[PDB]
């Protein structure tokens, strides 16, 4: 999901090891951002779940 600017920067690199290392770094950064977003979403989601299950029971009763 790296931006087109990142792809252009990767294409700029000439040496195969240099471009491979840049691609690996971009992969690591994208993975870190995705993991941060997923953990943050999970925290917010549990915070919803912190609502006492009586909300689910009320939903079933309705």
């Amino acid at each position: 999901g790296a931006e087109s600017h990142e792809l252009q920067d990767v294409l700029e690199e000439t040496n195969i090891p240099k471009r491979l290392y840049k691609a690996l770094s971009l992969l690591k950064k994208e993975f870190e951002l995705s993991k941060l977003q997923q953990r943050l979403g999970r925290e917010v989601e549990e915070k919803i779940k912190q609502t006492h299950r009586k909300y689910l029971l009320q939903e079933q009763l309705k």
């Binding site: 999901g1 951002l33 977003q37």
Partner: protein
């Protein structure tokens, strides 16, 4: 109309991506409105000059 945003407009849109994915999933699993609006308004087209409006519309679909 407060629209404070960080100067790093690089990783913020990552969350937007997640949001749209979620929205897509919902409309795929719970079809509520036509998908033509999704085709007309695509996050990749750069026509979303007001991402807050996009987020508000997405929350409206809930």
């Amino acid at each position: 109309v407060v629209h404070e945003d960080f100067q790093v407009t690089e990783e913020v849109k990552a969350l937007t991506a997640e949001i749209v994915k979620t929205i897509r999933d919902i409309i795929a699993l719970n079809p509520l409105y036509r998908e033509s609006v999704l085709q007309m308004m695509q996050a990749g087209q750069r026509v979303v000059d007001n991402p807050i409006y996009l987020s508000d519309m997405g929350a409206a679909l809930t």
